[PDB]
Amino acid sequence: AFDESFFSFGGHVGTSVEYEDKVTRGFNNTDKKEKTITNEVFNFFYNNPQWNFMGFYSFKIENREQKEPGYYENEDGIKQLFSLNKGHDLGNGWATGLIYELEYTRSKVYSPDVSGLRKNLAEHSIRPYLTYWNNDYNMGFYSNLEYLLSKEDRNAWGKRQEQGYSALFKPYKRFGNWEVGVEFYYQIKTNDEKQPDGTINEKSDFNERYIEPIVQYSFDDAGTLYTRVRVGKNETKNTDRSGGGNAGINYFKDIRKATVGYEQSIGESWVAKAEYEYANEVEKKSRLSGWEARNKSELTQHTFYAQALYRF
Ligand SMILES: OC[C@H]1O[C@@H]2O[C@H]3[C@H](O)[C@@H](O)[C@@H](O[C@H]4[C@@H](O)[C@H](O)[C@@H](O[C@H]5[C@H](O)[C@@H](O)[C@@H](O[C@H]6[C@H](O)[C@@H](O)[C@@H](O[C@H]7[C@H](O)[C@@H](O)[C@@H](O[C@H]1[C@H](O)[C@@H]2O)O[C@@H]7CO)O[C@@H]6CO)O[C@@H]5CO)O[C@@H]4CO)O[C@@H]3CO
Ligand SMILES: OC[C@H]1O[C@@H]2O[C@H]3[C@H](O)[C@@H](O)[C@@H](O[C@H]4[C@H](O)[C@@H](O)[C@@H](O[C@H]5[C@H](O)[C@@H](O)[C@@H](O[C@H]6[C@H](O)[C@@H](O)[C@@H](O[C@H]7[C@H](O)[C@@H](O)[C@@H](O[C@H]1[C@H](O)[C@H]2O)O[C@@H]7CO)O[C@@H]6CO)O[C@@H]5CO)O[C@@H]4CO)O[C@@H]3CO
Ligand SMILES: CCCCCCCCOCCOCCOCCOCCO
């Protein structure tokens, strides 16, 4: 019945906190230090197997502090995420569906040069997906395509739009208490950034690929321990219209990440999770403009995440 289907949902409500510590030693060979805290005051996962529909909502408060020689910048923001997933069971271990995700961020920036500069960001993700699970082999995969559109209005600092596509394929296998998988990812996008008077800051083409093995182990008397290691590369190729010395300049980045996390149920209703991620990204240019002290820009990032969920 339609009326009673409305009440056939489960899911969870939760909260989380994320702390990011970043240091970027740039082409100027000096350190830009950034610390970010993200307070997810509410998230809501909604699962209605009657509709084969899943939904997700999140409300986050974000605070970032940037420090470097002769400059600082603070940014405070609010981020809301709306996610809809309509799935369809195809039988024999196959399923498909469509995800539509909208994420909106509003923030203000404070520095010695601006006082409360406003930024509005809207990101849209549309992801058709295809999943398979073979019960006899205890093996399967997740796969999806994606269209991603990002539009940001930074008022006096102009507008930026990114648009592109990605593809992801993640085969995985379970055996005993183990699960092992490998995520393969490819993304392409265009970047367009302009000043308020139309002056082009950037017009460039981007692509990224990575491979990310994942290993997890589920303990009988408790939770699940997991680790992920990513090796990736990306490149940004500027057209001859980019500004600021970047006309025709290419950027090449090597990416390495390692994650360790643990999730465990607490009684029948609660679940807690903690995760640490290390990231190191090293970038070089095809040619230096002349102001740079070296042809190297290196990010080192440590991220800590903790989450508590109440299931119903
Ligand atoms: O932005 C979309 C989002 O989802 C996509 O995930 C796919 C996934 O590839 C599939 O494997 C499948 O996942 C199903 C189960 O495998 C899975 O266990 C379950 O997830 C539970 C989980 O047990 C629990 O941890 C919790 O999830 C919360 C996470 O702990 C948080 O980290 C946070 O998750 C965010 C991710 O960190 C982001 O990467 C992203 O997730 C993407 C994925 O990359 C992937 O494309 O955004 C997430 C939300 O912001 O929040 C989670 C909820 O609070 O609860 C989960 C739900 O019970 O979920 C699947 C079956 O229900 O299906 C996915 C398609 O939706
Ligand atoms: O306070 C200003 C700024 O100071 C510090 O920036 C350093 C930077 O770390 C160094 O790498 C170097 O910057 C180089 C760039 O690497 C090089 O690409 C080019 O930059 C041009 C941009 O590529 C072009 O887009 C445009 O920049 C825009 C920018 O896209 C807008 O977002 C907006 O930038 C603002 C920043 O968002 C804000 O954080 C702050 O910037 C700090 C920075 O955080 C800090 O690390 O202020 C700016 C507004 O001033 O506006 C700009 C301007 O249109 O233009 C640039 C310039 O051609 O060239 C620069 C300079 O060689 O040096 C800077 C300064 O030391
Ligand atoms: C509402 C946004 C629609 C934009 C068009 C997306 C078209 C992408 O489809 C490409 C192929 O996808 C394979 C099957 O996708 C599953 C469709 O079922 C969705 C049920 O609503």
Side-chain angles (χ1 to χ4, degrees):
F2 183 95
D3 221 334
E4 70 172 313
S5 79
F6 209 73
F7 296 88
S8 305
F9 64 97
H12 70 243
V13 288
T15 186
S16 74
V17 63
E18 183 175 4
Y19 172 72
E20 293 184 308
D21 183 311
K22 304 170 69 168
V23 179
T24 302
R25 181 168 296 189
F27 295 100
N28 50 11
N29 202 31
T30 60
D31 290 334
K32 170 175 68 169
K33 300 183 177 178
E34 291 174 277
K35 291 170 174 50
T36 303
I37 183 173
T38 301
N39 172 12
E40 182 174 39
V41 306
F42 180 70
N43 64 65
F44 178 17
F45 171 65
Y46 174 95
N47 179 26
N48 191 319
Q50 190 80 49
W51 299 346
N52 199 342
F53 171 83
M54 295 182 181
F56 186 69
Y57 171 78
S58 172
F59 186 108
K60 290 173 181 176
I61 299 167
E62 297 175 339
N63 293 100
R64 180 177 61 88
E65 293 191 342
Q66 170 185 340
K67 297 179 161 60
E68 61 185 85
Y71 183 74
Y72 76 90
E73 172 176 312
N74 301 315
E75 182 172 356
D76 69 89
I78 298 178
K79 177 181 280 171
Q80 297 185 77
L81 170 72
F82 304 85
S83 184
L84 303 184
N85 179 341
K86 176 70 182 81
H88 198 63
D89 198 318
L90 297 169
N92 291 298
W94 293 91
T96 189
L98 184 64
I99 292 161
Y100 184 27
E101 238 158 45
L102 302 178
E103 189 168 54
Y104 301 103
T105 307
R106 168 183 94 186
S107 64
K108 290 184 179 175
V109 182
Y110 304 84
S111 81
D113 299 314
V114 302
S115 181
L117 180 142
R118 300 177 180 192
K119 291 165 49 177
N120 294 332
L121 174 65
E123 302 206 301
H124 314 240
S125 177
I126 295 165
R127 309 200 298 278
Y129 64 88
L130 175 66
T131 65
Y132 178 61
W133 170 252
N134 187 291
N135 206 42
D136 289 340
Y137 273 102
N138 292 297
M139 298 176 58
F141 68 84
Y142 185 91
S143 68
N144 68 271
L145 298 174
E146 172 182 49
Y147 167 76
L148 180 66
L149 171 68
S150 172
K151 290 169 75 172
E152 191 181 30
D153 179 8
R154 301 92 69 89
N155 286 284
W157 291 348
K159 292 177 179 186
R160 185 180 173 93
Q161 175 174 300
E162 306 180 0
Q163 183 176 213
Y165 305 90
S166 76
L168 182 149
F169 172 64
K170 186 197 80 184
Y172 64 97
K173 180 181 188 189
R174 295 178 188 155
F175 51 101
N177 290 8
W178 297 92
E179 179 178 319
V180 174
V182 180
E183 195 167 280
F184 301 90
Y185 176 85
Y186 184 60
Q187 174 189 17
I188 58 170
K189 77 181 177 188
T190 58
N191 303 298
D192 286 278
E193 181 182 321
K194 296 181 182 61
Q195 297 181 19
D197 65 3
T199 300
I200 297 169
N201 288 338
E202 175 169 17
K203 179 181 182 179
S204 62
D205 295 308
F206 168 98
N207 72 87
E208 174 169 310
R209 59 233 293 174
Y210 68 73
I211 301 173
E212 184 182 289
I214 177 173
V215 177
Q216 73 186 37
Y217 183 82
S218 292
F219 293 91
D220 287 332
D221 307 282
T224 297
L225 177 66
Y226 62 90
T227 184
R228 310 195 305 261
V229 177
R230 180 184 295 186
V231 172
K233 283 185 183 278
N234 71 42
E235 56 180 36
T236 301
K237 301 197 178 189
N238 284 270
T239 74
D240 51 18
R241 301 193 76 187
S242 288
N246 288 304
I249 300 302
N250 302 327
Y251 288 74
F252 304 97
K253 184 179 296 186
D254 288 318
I255 295 151
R256 300 175 65 153
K257 308 189 190 188
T259 299
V260 171
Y262 179 76
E263 184 165 40
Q264 187 190 306
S265 298
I266 302 165
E268 297 300 323
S269 301
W270 294 87
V271 186
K273 170 182 166 184
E275 184 185 273
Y276 164 76
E277 178 199 272
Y278 169 86
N280 179 253
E281 299 179 358
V282 175
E283 189 170 39
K284 71 180 180 180
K285 307 186 195 193
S286 57
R287 188 182 75 243
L288 301 176
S289 173
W291 55 266
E292 305 91 331
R294 65 183 196 161
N295 193 2
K296 183 174 173 180
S297 182
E298 179 169 11
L299 165 67
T300 299
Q301 181 169 330
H302 303 270
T303 305
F304 314 79
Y305 176 80
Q307 172 187 275
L309 315 174
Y310 180 84
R311 311 146 130 177
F312 50 85

